[PDB]
Design a protein around this ligand. Structure first.
Ligand code: CLA
Ligand code: CLA
Ligand code: CLA
Ligand code: CLA
Ligand code: CLA
Ligand code: CLA
Ligand code: CLA
Ligand SMILES: CCCCCCCCCCCCCCCC(=O)OC[C@H](COP(=O)(O)OC[C@@H](O)CO)OC(=O)CCCCCCCCCCCCCCC
Ligand SMILES: CCCCCCCCCCCCCCCC(=O)OC[C@H](COP(=O)(O)OC[C@@H](O)CO)OC(=O)CCCCCCCCCCCCCCC
Ligand SMILES: CCCCCCCCCCCCO[C@H]1O[C@H](CO)[C@@H](O[C@H]2O[C@H](CO)[C@@H](O)[C@H](O)[C@H]2O)[C@H](O)[C@H]1O
Ligand SMILES: CC1=C(C/C=C(\C)CCC[C@H](C)CCC[C@H](C)CCCC(C)C)C(=O)c2ccccc2C1=O
Ligand code: SF4
Ligand code: SF4
Lengths: 34, 41, 742, 80, 95, 62, 141, 163
């Protein structure tokens, strides 16, 4: 583990921030009329 | 009596009689010739 | 008004219709064209109200068929008594109840079946039985095979009498429709005679026969030396020697000195220390009190003699400002439709059977029954399953009534109409309740599993961790345990030993009953039970309420009670009929009852049943692991199914091998049902087309055209084989385990 | 938006029209059958797809056919 | 719903006909105090715009989650605390 | 078309009784009838009927 | 025939239900069925429950065309009652729908034109491979 | 015996629903009409402020009393942070819902007719700008309520039966 602190940042990011953004964007996209 | 004979010729009754006779025959054969694994003849 | 009305020689007795297989139906009588005809014939046989339109013929057929079922039951009882008289070790068991295993079935030596004849004791070889007939016969005072043989002969005679009565009342003297509609007279006669007189007769038998014989047996007198039952009637000196109050005759009864009979009409709780069963003197005072109460109750309804209540007026009187017309119109429904009566009676009988199971394990009424663990488990599970089936049938036949016999003209603004007018609110609130219960109970189990897997047992919902105590049940237990001091002072002990207060009863080095502690696990498991029960009720009630129409299909009542669908339109309308709602309620009832019987088995084995040795130290079968291991799904899987199935899977080569064979066969049948459940009809019809081509190629195609099973038939076959497989699996598992360790 | 087609094997027994729960079908004068009438499907926008018409048609193979297609608030049978 | 008689259909009143009512809607304009409204409109009014609110929420959530995850003390999180016991050998002596 | 009482074989490809023999019931002699022949069979189809109308060119003389 | 209009006729005597109109009627179409009765009678509402129909004209709001047609079919086959029903839009537009030319659909009437009739057997339809990369459906031909 | 309590909704038998003591009742109707959600003439920002304050204040307790750090020395801070995070997630949900539901041109969707047939101005909550203002107010009020509950529980002692 050269860094050993990177997981403590990446795992919360990919686990919480990424799903929130992607679900919000997809929900906005599918709930349109264009 | 003709109606009774016609009723006794129905599929369930005939099947019951036939399978009862067959089961009795097999059971008696296994009573007198038990534990038969290979055919001696 | 109330009188006997019959018709002479309505139906002529002949064998002509026995040669017309589908005579009862106008469409089936023409004969078969496809294989669907056979299934339709065997499916519509006993559905009388679909053949004709007049209530008289339906009522007569129902009466005769009920006579036939009574005759069948009498044959069954006679068979049990005879097989116990000739193929049992009942006398040897009578000598030594605590070491001889009951056995009443013997197998022939044919293909190695010998191994099933186990060494039950008493110089006897046979299958150990769990029906509890030995205990019932001992409580009745039977001490010889001659009495059992006489009872068997009497049962056969009664079966013949019932058969003759059925033939008489259908083919010779059939009652008219006005005879069947005398509900007041029927309730009076049944409630007074059938119940009160029957209870009084049984109380007489107990007092005059069973009390002295069982008293002598409990004292220690050898069964062969006990005088015969008639010697206590012809010679009252013996009965006065046992119970001295018989020396006064019936004078205290008529002078109202009822306290003189206090030595054989007692009011004492608990169990007999010698036998681990209820005192028979209490059973005497209670069948007598039941007789008196029922005889008083049966003189209530109006009949030819003026006095009495009229049910129509009573129903029409109770109505209020929230319910419009109230209970008006129900009398005509319940005196016009057999299906409504069937629904009510099925519901009540199922609930009563469940109550019987609970009260029978909690207060064992027969001698040497509590310490026979196999009999207790078997009886509880059996009558619980029976009750579940009956309560599902109640909903089924209520939906049948709603589809067929409902008439909107008679029901304008009464309770039925107003229930049908706020059904969406009912179903919505019940859906919310089901979801809430499922989450806040099964999610608790899953939370416990996840905490245990993560190595955080301090965050679980356990007794050592965060606690969930059943304070209401604990308070009820404590209150019922203190009754013999404050609120029921004339009682000696509490109603049962299961309440918190009390002591231990041990018979032959085994615990009969014991106070049952309630903790977090019991809280969890009763709230699981509540979840499953509310869900089953949701399914069945949605089926009943939406049986006639909905928003999806406004004319569902035109399609009938039992139809597959209404096509792939509207998105798809599969299983919109009340029959399919019963079809799903059966699965959920199976789920509920399985959880209930698993809870009973584990809790009893872990906290009640066990062996006691000197100095009064108790060792339980599973060592009290229910409190800790039942809070997790993994705990159940490991410490109940994996641990307790070791007996059934190791029973090969012993007298218990049949249980392992049926264990495997039941797993097999349950798997086999899935192919009917998961598939559809068109695939099988096309495959049958190919097979029919194959048979046609050799000039051997059948005259009756083969057809795939109908959609409803496919569902019915699937659910039937599924239920049989699951229940037989549980049957084999329970019997093997409890016979081995009990 | 289902599509309902009538084929020239029709005999004009009018059973499909009587079976339709949403009045999609109707009888039209015709020549080619003894009854001298044939079925038509002008209101296909109201078809729900129940296929009662197909169940009611006596013919070796059906003279009225329903082809399920795009779903609409009327086709889905929604009361809300 | 014209309402004069058992008539409930009226093309003139289509909102009454379709049952488009406000069950509990109340239109009294006086609810709060003036200075309360001044303070709240001054301070809470920044987040009125919705796109800016989305951007601020996403950036703030990401920053907060990252900062808490990467700076949490070992005495709170067991994963950051790490193992404290000697490792256990495998079945066949495999580590 | 075929005379009344004839035995004919169905040649309609989507028919349930394809390659099966029938029994001619009645023939319509109106000029514009498209399927004038009426044939009755022994076994019922899936829908449960046993009668159909066929064109004269969808039947065989045997 | 000249399609009829709508008016202010009394509704049947009904005590209410949870199977009535919803927001769909507010923001979309809803249906109205009219009929005349010789006497007051009790009939089953398609939404569940029992109602009393008035003597003379009657008017009933329903959420679906299927409900109107089921109630009308029951009225015709059980009470011998002629009926009409319409479609109402939120803006006030009214569309007359069931007896489109005054004659019930099961009776052949002159002036009707065939729609959707194909002049062939169902077995003469083309193959899906022939109409590849084309918008036809082989039953529209 | 002719007196009855249950009535069809607003007297129309053919609208789905009943008018019961639970639905219509002077106490229940007054309480529901005086809640901030049904104050249609009040600016959405202040209604959102009150709603957010109430919800953020109620949310603090469950997260503090039950949680991974409930037995540690930082239980209050951890619970307050969890409640604030939940408020943030719900603010994001409100924002995306408002974006997906309302456009900048639509007048309003709330009913403008009272039960008694009176015509009133439709609520401005069911608009893009109205929902945006309500969401901002809800966010600010929720944070303020969480902070207030934390201050009362731990910044000042204020003994409580369970705390
Ligand atoms: C398919 C490839 C793949 C997969 C499944 C994983 C899986 C994982 N990585 Mg990883 N990683 C990968 C490639 C991959 N890695 C590569 C190529 C790099 C070099 C840039 C890294 C650098 C990396 C770091 C620095 C860290 C992880 C971590 C992790 C773990 C947590 C997830 C996370 O934080 O993601 C973070 C992911 C990235 C930073 C980049 C991933 C590369 C792309 C996104 C893969 C493409 C995915 C897929 C093809 C897209 C389509 C999806 C359908 C998880 C076991 C964390 C860990 O160790 O937890 C214990 C951590 O801190 N990864
Ligand atoms: C493919 C399935 C299959 C096959 C091939 C067999 C084959 C056999 N079984 Mg088996 N069995 C099976 C399924 C099968 N079984 C199943 C499913 C069960 C459970 C119900 C059993 C239970 C079973 C038992 C309990 C016994 C057998 C026995 C036998 C033997 C027959 C004895 C004999 O010759 O009778 C002689 C009968 C005839 C020659 C018939 C003559 C008919 C006419 C009159 C002739 C002209 C034979 C090896 C018996 C045996 O000895 O095993 C070694 C035995 O005791 N089987
Ligand atoms: C529900 C009713 C019932 C049932 C399930 C049985 C079942 C049985 N009886 Mg039984 N039996 C019954 C009623 C019943 N009996 C009645 C009412 C009588 C009196 C007429 C008898 C008299 C009787 C005799 C005399 C014998 C059996 C025997 C048997 C066994 C073999 C029967 C066979 O295959 O042939 C079988 C367990 C046989 C048996 O157990 O042999 C060991 C045997 O010999 N039964
Ligand atoms: C249907 C019920 C029934 C029947 C037929 C009998 C029948 C009889 N009883 Mg009995 N008895 C019964 C219920 C019954 N008893 C009950 C419930 C009690 C308890 C209150 C008694 C208490 C009782 C006493 C105390 C005596 C009888 C006696 C008798 C006998 C003379 C009369 C007769 C055999 C007398 C007798 O001869 O004793 C054997 C006698 O002295 N009985
Ligand atoms: C004493 C109780 C009792 C009585 C008298 C009846 C009587 C009846 N039931 Mg019922 N039923 C009961 C209990 C009872 N049921 C229970 C407990 C259940 C729950 C499983 C059911 C579930 C049930 C279903 C799903 C159906 C019936 C049907 C019927 C009718 C014809 C049954 C038949 O054709 O047999 C045929 C027997 C067999 C095919 C043997 C199979 C094993 C008949 C009125 C049928 C009906 O009402 O049709 C309109 C029907 O579909 N019953
Ligand atoms: C895969 C991603 C992921 C990650 C990184 C986490 C991480 C965590 N979970 Mg978890 N969880 C996840 C998925 C994840 N979860 C899923 C999928 C589920 C559903 C089954 C759960 C269900 C769950 C429960 C039920 C609980 C947790 C809890 C926790 C926390 C316990 C550790 C601790 O010290 O608490 C200390 C935590 C705090 C002091 C909270 C401060 C963190 C604040 C709230 C961050 C601010 C939020 C931010 C603005 C949101 C931005 C969104 C854009 C930890 C932060 C526990 C918890 O809330 O704590 C808890 O009770 N989790
Ligand atoms: C498991 C749920 C739970 C838990 C642990 C708590 C825990 C707590 N609540 Mg609480 N509360 C809850 C649900 C819960 N509440 C619910 C559902 C409501 C209704 C909205 C409230 C309404 C409420 C109020 C109004 C107040 C509390 C307060 C409190 C605290 C002191 C009592 C305590 C931390 C008090 C508090 O924090 O004051 C400082 C306080 O004033 N609660
Ligand atoms: C033991 C418990 C009871 C068992 C069944 C008893 C059945 C008694 C007779 C019932 C029918 C009464 C009406 C008769 C009239 C009737 O049924 O239809 C009337 C009909 C008349 O037929 P005929 O050809 O005689 O007359 C036709 C006329 O058109 C001109 O004469 O048939 C008979 O007479 C046969 C009667 C016996 C039919 C059953 C015969 C076999 C019965 C026993 C079967 C089991 C035998 C076991 C032996 C071990
Ligand atoms: C609690 C509700 C309560 O007080 O129920 C009791 C209440 C009694 O109403 P009434 O006094 O008008 O009933 C008069 C007769 O119908 C009683 O047989 O009935 C209802 O409210 C209807 C069922 C509501 C069920 C709600 C769940
Ligand atoms: C519903 C009734 C069903 C049963 C019907 C048959 C009942 C038979 C029992 C009734 C007789 C009661 O018997 C009771 O009083 C008898 C005198 O009357 C006593 O009989 C005693 O005195 C008799 C003279 O009176 C002597 O002949 C007896 O040898 C002597 O034992 C019995 O010792 C006592 O048990
Ligand atoms: C397997 C299966 C079939 C096929 C099963 C069939 C056709 C049933 C066959 C029953 C037995 C085996 C027929 C026996 C016929 C005679 C009684 C045989 C007499 C001769 C001796 C064997 C006695 C369906 O038709 C079906 C329909 C709808 C949903 C699911 C399914 C489904 O799963
Ligand atoms: S899948 Fe079967 S049950 Fe469902 S709509 Fe089609 S035919 Fe009916
Ligand atoms: S599928 Fe149903 S709605 Fe469509 S035309 Fe056929 S019967 Fe009418």
């Amino acid at each position: 583990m050269t860094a050993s602190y990177l997981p403590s940042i990446f795992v919360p990011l990919i686990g919480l921030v990424f799903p929130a953004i992607t679900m919000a964007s997809l929900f906005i996209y599918i709930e349109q009329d264009e | 009596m003709q109606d009774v004979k016609t009723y006794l010729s129905t599929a369930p009754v005939l099947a019951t009689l036939w399978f009862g006779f067959l089961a009795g025959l097999l059971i008696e054969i296994n009573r007198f010739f038990p534990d038969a694994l290979v055919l001696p003849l | 008004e109330v009188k006997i009305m019959v018709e002479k020689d309505p139906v002529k007795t002949s064998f002509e219709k026995w040669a017309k297989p589908g005579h009862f139906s106008r469409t089936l009588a023409k004969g078969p064209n496809t294989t669907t005809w056979i299934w339709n014939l065997h499916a519509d046989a006993h559905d009388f109200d679909s053949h004709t339109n007049d209530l008289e013929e339906i009522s007569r057929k129902v009466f005769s068929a009920h006579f036939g079922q009574l005759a069948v039951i009498f044959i069954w009882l006679s068979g049990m008594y005879f097989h116990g008289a000739r193929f049992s070790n009942y006398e040897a068991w009578l000598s030594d109840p605590t070491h001889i295993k009951p056995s009443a079935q013997v197998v022939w030596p044919i293909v190695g079946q010998k191994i099933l004849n186990g060494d039950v004791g008493g110089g006897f070889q046979g299958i150990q039985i769990t029906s509890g007939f030995f205990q019932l016969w001992r409580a009745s005072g039977i001490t010889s095979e001659l009495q059992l043989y006489t009872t068997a002969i009497g049962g056969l005679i009664f079966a013949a009498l019932m058969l003759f009565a059925g033939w008489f009342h259908y083919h010779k003297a059939a009652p008219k429709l006005a005879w069947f509609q005398n509900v007041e007279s029927m309730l009076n006669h049944h409630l007074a005679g059938l119940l009160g007189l029957g209870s009084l007769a049984w109380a007489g038998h107990q007092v005059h026969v069973s009390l002295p014989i069982n008293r002598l047996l409990d004292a220690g007198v050898d069964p062969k030396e006990i005088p015969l039952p008639h010697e206590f009637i012809l010679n009252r000196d013996l009965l006065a020697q046992l119970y001295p109050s018989f020396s006064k005759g019936l004078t205290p009864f008529f002078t109202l000195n009822w306290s003189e009979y206090s030595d054989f009409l007692t009011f004492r709780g608990g169990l007999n220390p010698v036998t681990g069963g209820l005192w028979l003197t209490d059973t005497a005072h209670h069948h007598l009190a039941i007789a008196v109460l029922f005889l008083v109750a049966g003189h209530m309804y109006r009949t030819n003699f003026g006095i009495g209540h009229s049910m129509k007026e009573i129903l029409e009187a109770h109505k209020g400002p929230f319910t419009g017309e109230g209970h008006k119109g129900l009398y005509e429904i319940l005196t016009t439709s057999w299906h409504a009566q069937l629904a009510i009676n099925l519901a009540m009988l199922g609930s009563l059977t469940i109550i019987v199971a609970h009260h029978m394990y909690a207060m064992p009424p027969y001698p040497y029954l509590a310490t026979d663990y196999a009999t207790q488990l078997s009886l509880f599970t059996h009558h619980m399953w029976i009750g579940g089936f009956l309560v599902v049938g109640a909903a089924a036949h209520a939906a049948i009534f709603m589809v067929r016999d409902y008439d909107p003209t008679t029901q304008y603004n009464n309770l039925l109409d107003r229930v049908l007018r706020h059904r969406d609110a009912i179903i919505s609130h019940l859906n919310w309740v089901c979801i809430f219960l499922g989450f806040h109970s099964f999610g608790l189990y899953i939370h416990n599993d996840t905490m245990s897997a993560l190595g955080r047992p301090q965050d679980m919902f356990s007794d050592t961790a965060i606690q969930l105590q059943p304070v209401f049940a604990q308070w009820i237990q404590n209150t019922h345990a203190l009754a013999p001091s404050l609120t029921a002072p004339n009682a000696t002990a509490s109603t049962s030993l299961t309440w918190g207060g009390g002591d231990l009863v041990a018979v032959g080095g085994k615990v009969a009953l014991l106070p049952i502690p309630l903790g977090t696990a019991d809280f969890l498991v009763h709230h699981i039970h509540a979840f499953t029960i509310h869900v089953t009720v949701l399914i069945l009630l949605k089926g009943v309420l939406f049986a006639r129409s909905s928003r999806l299909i406004p004319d569902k009542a035109n399609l009938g009670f039992r139809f597959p669908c209404d096509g792939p339109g509207r998105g798809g309308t599969c299983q919109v009929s009340a029959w399919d709602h019963v079809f799903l309620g059966l699965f959920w009832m199976y789920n509920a009852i399985s959880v209930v019987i698993f809870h009973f088995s584990w809790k009893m084995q872990s906290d009640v049943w066990g062996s006691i040795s000197d100095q009064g130290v108790v060792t339980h079968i599973t060592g009290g692991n229910f409190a800790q291991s039942s809070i997790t799904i993994n705990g159940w899987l490991r410490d109940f199914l994996w641990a307790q199935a070791s007996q059934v899977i190791q029973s090969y080569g012993s007298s218990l091998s049949a249980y392992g064979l049926l264990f495997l066969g039941a797993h097999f049948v349950w798997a086999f049902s899935l192919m009917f459940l998961f598939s559809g009809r068109g695939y099988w019809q096309e495959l049958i087309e190919s097979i029919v081509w194959a048979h046609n190629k050799l000039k051997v195609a059948p005259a009756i055209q083969p057809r795939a099973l109908s959609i409803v038939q496919g569902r019915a076959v699937g659910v039937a084989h599924y239920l049989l497989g699951g229940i037989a699996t549980t049957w084999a598992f329970f019997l093997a385990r409890i016979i081995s360790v009990g | 938006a289902h599509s309902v087609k009538i084929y020239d094997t029709c005999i004009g027994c009018t059973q499909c029209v009587r079976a339709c729960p949403t009045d999609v079908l109707e009888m039209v004068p015709w020549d080619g059958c003894k009854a001298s009438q044939i079925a038509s499907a002008p209101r296909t926008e109201d078809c729900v797809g129940c296929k009662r018409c197909e169940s009611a048609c006596p013919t070796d193979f059906l003279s009225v056919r329903v082809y399920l297609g795009a779903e609409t608030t009327r086709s889905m049978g929604l009361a809300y | 719903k014209y309402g004069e008689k058992s008539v409930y259909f009226d093309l003139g009143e289509i909102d009454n006909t379709t049952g488009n009512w406000d069950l509990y809607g109340n239109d009294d304009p006086n609810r709060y105090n003036g200075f309360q409204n001044k303070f709240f409109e001054t301070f809470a009014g920044a987040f009125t715009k919705r796109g800016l609110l989305l951007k601020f929420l996403v950036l703030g959530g990401a920053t907060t989650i990252g900062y808490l995850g990467s700076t949490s003390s070992p005495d709170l999180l067991a994963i950051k605390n790490g193992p404290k016991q000697v490792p256990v050998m495998g079945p066949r002596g495999r580590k | 078309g075929p005379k009344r009482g004839s035995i004919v074989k169905v040649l309609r490809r989507e028919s349930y009784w394809f390659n099966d023999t029938g029994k001619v019931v009645a023939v319509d002699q109106a000029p514009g009838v498209r399927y004038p022949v009426v044939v009755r069979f022994d076994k019922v189809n899936y829908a449960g009927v046993s009668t159909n109308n066929y064109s004269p060119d969808e039947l065989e003389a045997a | 025939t000249p399609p009829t209009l709508n008016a202010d006729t009394p509704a049947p005597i009904f005590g209410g239900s949870t199977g009535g109109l919803l927001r769909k009627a507010q923001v979309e179409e809803f249906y109205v069925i009219t009929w005349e009765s010789p006497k007051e009678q009790i009939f089953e509402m398609p939404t569940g429950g029992a109602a009393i129909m008035r003597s003379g004209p009657n008017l009933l709001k329903l959420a679906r065309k299927e409900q109107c047609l089921a109630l009308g079919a029951r009225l015709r086959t059980k009470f011998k009652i002629q009926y009409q029903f319409y479609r109402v839009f939120p803006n006030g537009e009214v569309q007359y729908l069931h007896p489109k030319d005054g004659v019930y659909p099961e009776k052949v009437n002159a002036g009707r034109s065939p729609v959707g009739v194909n002049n062939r057997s169902i077995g003469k339809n083309a193959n899906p491979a022939e109409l590849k990369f084309a918008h036809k459906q082989a039953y529209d031909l | 015996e002719k007196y009855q309590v249950i009535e069809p909704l607003n007297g129309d038998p053919f609208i789905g629903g009943f008018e019961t003591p639970v639905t219509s009742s002077p106490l229940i109707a007054w309480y529901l009409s005086n809640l901030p959600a049904y104050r249609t003439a009040v600016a959405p920002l202040l209604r959102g402020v009150e709603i957010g304050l109430a919800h953020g204040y109620l949310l603090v307790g469950p997260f503090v009393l039950t949680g991974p750090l409930r037995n540690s020395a930082v239980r209050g801070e951890a619970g307050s942070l969890a409640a604030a995070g939940l408020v943030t997630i719900l603010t994001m949900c409100l924002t995306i819902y408002g974006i997906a539901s309302f456009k900048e041109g639509e007048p309003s969707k709330a009913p403008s007719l009272t039960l008694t047939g009176r015509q009133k101005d439709a609520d401005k909550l069911q608009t893009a700008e109205g929902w945006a203002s309500f969401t901002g107010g809800w966010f600010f009020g929720g944070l303020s309520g969480v902070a207030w509950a934390y201050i009362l529980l731990y910044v000042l002692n204020l003994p409580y039966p369970v705390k």
